[PDB]
Amino acid sequence: AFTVTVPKDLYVVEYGSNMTIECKFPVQLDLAALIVYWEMEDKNIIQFVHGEEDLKTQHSSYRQRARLLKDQLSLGNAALQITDVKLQDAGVYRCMISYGGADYKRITVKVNAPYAAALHEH
Amino acid sequence: AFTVTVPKDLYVVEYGSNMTIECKFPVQLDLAALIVYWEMEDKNIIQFVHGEEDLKTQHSSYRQRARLLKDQLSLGNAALQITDVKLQDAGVYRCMISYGGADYKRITVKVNAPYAAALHEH
């Protein structure tokens, strides 16, 4: 059965940093058979369908900050890079991968920030 | 955990008939959070992403014959209707559903046909 794995399911990062969170899936890669869908608490981050990124329902809090590392896909690695991490990025992410089957995993992200930074986003 | 279920995982149909095969997923439905991806033995049938059907990598053997019944989605039912069933439609279908998680199921389809009909497609 198709299984998605997460070697690391807890990330603790500082606000303003860049972070790359990863889900592994078994793989030469056939982009025509692949869907990668990253989401966090009902906010869509990445929809990648047959080699094309669809931003149509990406949540505005992630606009211009979220990237799927496409070169990693050929390694069986769905790697989501978030730049300039916000307080609002803390939470549980789900990677939903379809590739001859479908599975998902949950990744917890914590963001540390001083009071003034958390107040910026309050 | 998000689970996709198949009440019926074996369909036996006659060539030239219409058949509707179904996968259930737990659900008001948020089309913005949903992906339905139907495939059969490396042939893409349906990709339905945030309420829009993407035919870009649909396999040519299913062109004009495959429909996702959208009204069933609000019931937690991914229903794939194949019209004018061909011999080539026999095989194992996978429904890969992403909706706050992701899961899949396998459905076996057998197609009965007389010799002349199988010869048409040989």
Side-chain angles (χ1 to χ4, degrees), chain A residues 1-27 29-55 57-62 64-66 68-122, chain B residues 1-27 29-55 57-62 64-66 68-122:
Chain A
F2 182 77
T3 299
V4 164
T5 61
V6 274
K8 174 173 170 65
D9 63 18
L10 175 66
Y11 293 76
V12 177
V13 307
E14 306 300 305
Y15 87 111
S17 65
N18 301 339
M19 73 163 179
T20 302
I21 67 173
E22 298 173 305
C23 286
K24 313 299 194 210
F25 62 99
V27 169
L29 176 74
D30 179 9
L31 284 168
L34 174 68
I35 300 188
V36 177
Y37 179 11
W38 279 99
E39 173 263 2
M40 196 277 258
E41 299 166 8
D42 306 336
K43 299 195 264 324
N44 294 327
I45 308 174
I46 300 291
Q47 298 189 310
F48 187 80
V49 187
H50 61 64
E52 301 183 13
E53 184 170 358
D54 192 328
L55 304 170
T57 55
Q58 178 173 256
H59 195 270
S60 54
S61 69
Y62 287 98
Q64 207 71 29
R65 296 189 307 112
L68 182 69
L69 308 186
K70 295 192 260 190
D71 292 337
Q72 289 297 307
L73 294 172
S74 73
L75 300 174
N77 188 17
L80 168 69
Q81 179 189 81
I82 309 289
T83 53
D84 191 28
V85 162
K86 308 280 182 268
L87 275 304
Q88 86 97 36
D89 299 337
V92 179
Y93 291 69
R94 283 177 289 204
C95 63
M96 293 166 273
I97 300 162
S98 303
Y99 191 64
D103 194 15
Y104 76 112
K105 284 297 175 293
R106 293 162 35 97
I107 294 173
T108 300
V109 175
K110 310 284 187 197
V111 182
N112 295 321
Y115 173 66
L119 197 53
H120 282 40
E121 315 189 15
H122 192 228
Chain B
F2 182 77
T3 299
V4 164
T5 61
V6 274
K8 174 173 170 65
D9 63 18
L10 175 66
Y11 293 76
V12 177
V13 307
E14 306 300 305
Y15 87 111
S17 65
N18 301 339
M19 73 163 179
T20 302
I21 67 173
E22 298 173 305
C23 286
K24 313 299 194 210
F25 62 99
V27 169
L29 176 74
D30 179 9
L31 284 168
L34 174 68
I35 300 188
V36 177
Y37 179 11
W38 279 99
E39 173 263 2
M40 196 277 258
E41 299 166 8
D42 306 336
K43 299 195 264 324
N44 294 327
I45 308 174
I46 300 291
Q47 298 189 310
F48 187 80
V49 187
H50 61 64
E52 301 183 13
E53 184 170 358
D54 192 328
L55 304 170
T57 55
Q58 178 173 256
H59 195 270
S60 54
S61 69
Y62 287 98
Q64 207 71 29
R65 296 189 307 112
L68 182 69
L69 308 186
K70 295 192 260 190
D71 292 337
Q72 289 297 307
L73 294 172
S74 73
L75 300 174
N77 188 17
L80 168 69
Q81 179 189 81
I82 309 289
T83 53
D84 191 28
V85 162
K86 308 280 182 268
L87 275 304
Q88 86 97 36
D89 299 337
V92 179
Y93 291 69
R94 283 177 289 204
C95 63
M96 293 166 273
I97 300 162
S98 303
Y99 191 64
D103 194 15
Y104 76 112
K105 284 297 175 293
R106 293 162 35 97
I107 294 173
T108 300
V109 175
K110 310 284 187 197
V111 182
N112 295 321
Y115 173 66
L119 197 53
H120 282 40
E121 315 189 15
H122 192 228

